[PDB]
Design a protein around this ligand. Structure first.
Ligand code: MG
Ligand code: MG
Ligand code: MG
Ligand code: MG
Ligand code: MG
Ligand code: MG
Ligand code: MG
Ligand code: MG
Ligand code: MG
Ligand code: MG
Ligand code: MG
Ligand code: MG
Ligand code: MG
Ligand code: MG
Ligand code: MG
Ligand code: MG
Lengths: 110, 97, 99, 139, 243
RNA sequence: GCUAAACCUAGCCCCAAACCCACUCCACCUUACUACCAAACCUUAGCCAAACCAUUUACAUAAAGUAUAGGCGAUAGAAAUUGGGCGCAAUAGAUAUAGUACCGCAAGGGAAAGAUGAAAAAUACCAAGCAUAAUAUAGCAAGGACUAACCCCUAUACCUUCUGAUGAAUUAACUAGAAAUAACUUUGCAAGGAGAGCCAAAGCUAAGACCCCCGAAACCAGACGA
RNA sequence: CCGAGCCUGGUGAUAGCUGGUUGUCCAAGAUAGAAUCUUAGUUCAACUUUAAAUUUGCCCACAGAACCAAAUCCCCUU
RNA sequence: UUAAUUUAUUAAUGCAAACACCUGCAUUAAAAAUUUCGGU
């Protein structure tokens, strides 16, 4: 599968996006998908257990955790129940804050 | 009694000999070789059970349906015997019901 | 030292010995050498006469179509007959309910 | 379940995801949009088994969709027909018979199957009136 | 451990093994093919694919070949392709009852025929169905000429067919002595099932009888090595004559 | 100290491949191991599971454990089409030392064990019981103690149905939890997942974890016994 | 060993019946009903215990709880 | 066993089929075969 052909306006007709160039100078670093999207996913378990995670985190991930708590701070008030996967290089937040999290990563641009 | 009497035979074993040297060499055969042949053929072992690893009852079932017409009569009666045994064994008496 | 080189493919498609009593019937029949042709082209294969179906098989396929495929006009006529019968049944039921 | 096994199953193709593949470049619009195109880039997959029907368009939300295409699905909404035609699409609906659709959908293997090319049979009588009417923008 | 070739062809394995493997290739073909006959009770279904009755689904269906329970005595005559059936049945033909094992035996009749090809009368048991088969063939000689031996499904009729074939491929005057005109008329009439003279060798015999024909054929008094060495010395003398 | 122990290695284990066995002379279907006169095929049955009992029931990958059938009560069951060692080491593993002794009128059932060293033309201590040494008032044999072994004081033999009585002389060796569907947890990928199928409205693949041992009398086939 | 010979296979037959089922260390954890050719067993039933998600419970004080004794229940505060 | 039910099997009939023999279908028996002889 190759990289997408250029749709002239951003976001796309269905709203897809290219990652912005050059990447930002934030120590939190996000890679995209093999099929090229922003790497955010839900998580369903244990009947009522809804959570979410960003998968391919890299760098000093604790900064991304603090940022996610800060964005989440106005979102629900409670402190973020989050855990990184340092060997796996991931971050996960308890609860599904999914589309807004994708928006936060998109506004980060990188 | 139940122990040895002397120190047993000295375990001369070279851990770095040739017949173990390549142990798994050229055995990432599939994706590292442009998909010509899977590892699912690289195993040198019996054709009764070369890579469909079910239960014990499944193991015998595969042994029958693969090679039953190639056995001496003792093996055929034996495989039939244990196959009947296992078919009774799966769904009759256990811990979870 | 250095092991023997890893497994390669087979040397093209190989026909089997028809004299061999061990061969399963799945790879020595009519469509099997067809599969061999589909593997190694005509480059290793045989004359392409196996590709076209047999004339007896052609008549069999024609029979299969005649017992397995109608014409659109026949289906349309059946649909028209069914619709006319349904309308007549509906009119008769309405007349019986009205009376 | 009496006729669950005789029930037809048709893969619903999300046309918003068709717009995605248009944007993501899985299926380019420079050539016809066929089931060959619908499968070839892995945007939405078909299952020949389970006594299935085939590919049919979906019905939600054609806002912000700017492309030209020629869709050939088994079934679609009248809203989907108008969705295609709004930018000026092409909509056609033939059948795809079971062995025929199975040969069609994964064209890689039957291209190396060795038998000669089969031809698609006409739809059955129940499916016949569906294709017989142009109100479905069919074939 | 395991035996290499499969026992499902073990008997067939011996068919290619030794002295019996020196049997005629025509005998190999006649013992090799397995064409099936028309049944005695398994009425044939219509075609390959048909609509399901309770499902309305086009499904391909075949027919079961019911095994012919052949008693030994029926081989001693020319019976039909019919016989008995050793099976079971329900009391009211109802599967919700206790069924019992059952039998369906034939009703034979001792009749007689007078074959011109045999030019003799043979009286044996036959079936009224076999009578109808001969009548549809219009003559016992034509029936012997007509059906396959595998279609015959009887030893005595197979032997009669073997004799008829030997007589036809022999064309000896002893078939119709002092009447060669009738012999020629019958030979023209029986020109249909003409076979080679070699084909009369293993004609219809048992596989054991095939081994018998082999031992009667492959055996001979061994050549004398006095005679063999004499011939070798004669060859040496002929060669040294050129020396 | 004796009995004893211990020791490797006989050969068995499964697979890979491969088609094998049958004539020193002789004799050998009568009372088999003695040189000699007038006849074959005929449907396996049955329990079990229905918590009793009866119809029913087994003796490559993929569709698919779906279509067929069920005292519609238990389950059983497709075609189309597609393509050398993570084995042992004399109680273990072939019982194997041999289908022998013995047992039984026969068919049959079917055991046991040895250990040297390069050389046999080289002839170091321990399971239990005992003596080496027998005993000292009293009591589940022990504990706290002690000048001091015991006498001093406390002290209802163990494992288990029980609600509070059966087994075990004593050693030494054998001997008894393996079915992953669901869910979870941990990994890889992500609107796709996975080396044809299956599934997906956050899922899909890999692994992990649940399933004993002993013990009836029964019954049917096939023999063998007056 | 004749109350239906013996033996081999089928046969790891079968009964819900007894008994026995192997080393350690932390956290929690004991008695209510109803069916059942059933009380020697099993199934609806409750308790738990754990995993996740969602903020008040136990002890009570006023009022109140029926016509043909102890009391008990709902029940602010502590 | 006159509990129940058949009737695989015979033996009779009768009816079919063939021109005394064989096969099929009903009924009847003899003999069998399948299943029942509850609790406090
Ligand atoms: Mg999840
Ligand atoms: Mg039962
Ligand atoms: Mg098949
Ligand atoms: Mg041993
Ligand atoms: Mg042993
Ligand atoms: Mg001692
Ligand atoms: Mg005392
Ligand atoms: Mg214990
Ligand atoms: Mg005792
Ligand atoms: Mg017993
Ligand atoms: Mg046994
Ligand atoms: Mg048991
Ligand atoms: Mg019990
Ligand atoms: Mg009841
Ligand atoms: Mg009752
Ligand atoms: Mg009970």
């Amino acid at each position: 599968i190759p990289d997408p052909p250029k749709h002239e306006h951003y976001p796309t007709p269905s709203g897809w996006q290219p990652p912005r160039d050059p990447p930002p100078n934030l120590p939190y670093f996000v890679r995209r998908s093999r099929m090229h999207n922003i790497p955010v996913y839900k998580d369903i378990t244990h009947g009522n257990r809804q959570m979410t995670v960003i998968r391919k985190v890299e760098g000093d991930i604790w900064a991304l955790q603090k940022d996610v708590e800060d964005f989440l701070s106005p979102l629900l008030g409670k402190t973020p129940v989050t855990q990184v996967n340092e060997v796996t290089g991931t971050l996960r937040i308890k609860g599904y804050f999914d589309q807004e999290l994708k928006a936060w990563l998109l506004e980060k641009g990188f | 009694i139940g122990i040895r009497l002397t120190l047993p035979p000295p375990k001369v074993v070279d851990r770095w000999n040739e017949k173990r040297a390549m142990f798994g060499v050229y055995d990432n055969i599939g994706i590292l070789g442009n998909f010509e042949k899977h590892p699912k053929e690289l195993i040198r072992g019996p054709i009764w059970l070369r890579g469909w690893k079910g239960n014990e009852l499944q193991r015998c079932i595969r042994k029958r349906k693969m090679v039953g017409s190639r056995m001496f009569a003792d093996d055929l009666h034996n495989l039939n015997k244990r196959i009947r045994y296992l078919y009774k064994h799966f769904n009759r008496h256990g811990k979870f019901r | 030292y250095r092991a023997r080189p890893p497994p390669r493919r087979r040397p093209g498609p190989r026909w089997p010995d028809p004299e061999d009593l061990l061969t399963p019937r799945w790879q020595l029949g009519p469509r099997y050498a067809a599969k061999q042709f589909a593997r190694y082209g005509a480059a290793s294969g045989v004359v392409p006469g196996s590709l076209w179906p047999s004339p007896e098989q052609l008549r069999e396929l024609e029979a299969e179509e005649r017992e397995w495929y109608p014409s659109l006009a026949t289906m349309q006529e059946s649909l028209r007959v069914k619709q006319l019968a349904e309308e007549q049944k509906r009119r008769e039921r309405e007349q019986h309910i009205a009376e | 379940n009496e006729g669950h096994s005789f029930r037809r199953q048709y893969k619903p193709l999300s046309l918003n995801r068709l717009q995605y593949l248009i944007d993501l470049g899985r299926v380019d619009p420079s050539q016809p949009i066929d089931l060959t195109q619908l499968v070839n880039g892995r945007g939405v997959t078909i299952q020949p088994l389970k006594r299935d029907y085939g590919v049919q368009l979906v019905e939600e939300g054609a806002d912000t969709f700017t492309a030209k295409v020629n869709i050939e699905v088994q079934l679609a909404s009248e809203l989907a027909i108008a969705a295609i035609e709004k930018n000026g699409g092409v909509v056609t609906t033939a059948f795809y018979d079971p062995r025929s659709l199975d040969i069609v959908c994964k064209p890689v293997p039957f291209f190396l199957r060795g038998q000669p090319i089969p031809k698609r049979m006409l739809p059955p009588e129940e499916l016949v009136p569906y294709y017989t009417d142009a109100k479905n923008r069919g074939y | 451990p395991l035996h290499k070739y499969p026992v499902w062809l073990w008997k067939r394995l011996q068919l290619r093994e030794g002295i019996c493997s020196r049997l005629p290739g025509h005998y190999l073909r006649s013992l090799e093919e397995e064409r099936t006959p028309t049944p005695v009770h398994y009425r044939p279904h219509g075609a390959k694919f048909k609509i399901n009755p309770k499902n309305g689904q086009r499904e391909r269906v075949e027919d079961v070949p019911i095994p012919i329970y052949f008693p030994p005595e029926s081989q001693r005559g020319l019976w039909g392709g019919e016989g008995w059936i050793l099976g079971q049945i329900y009391a009211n033909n109802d599967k919700l009852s206790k069924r019992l094992k059952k039998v369906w035996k034939p009703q034979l009749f001792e009749r007689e025929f007078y074959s011109e090809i045999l030019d003799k009368k043979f009286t044996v048991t036959v079936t009224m169905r076999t009578l109808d088969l001969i009548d549809e063939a219009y003559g016992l000689d034509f029936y012997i000429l007509k059906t396959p031996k595998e279609d015959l499904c009887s030893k005595f009729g197979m032997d009669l067919k073997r004799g008829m074939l030997l007589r036809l491929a022999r064309q000896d005057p002893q078939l119709h002595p002092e009447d060669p005109e009738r012999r020629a008329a019958i030979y023209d009439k029986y020109k249909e099932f003409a076979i080679p003279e070699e084909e009369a060798e293993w004609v219809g015999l048992t596989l054991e009888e095939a081994i018998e024909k082999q031992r009667l054929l492959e055996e001979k008094d061994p050549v004398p090595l006095f005679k063999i060495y004499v011939a070798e010395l004669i060859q040496q003398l002929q060669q040294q004559a050129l020396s």
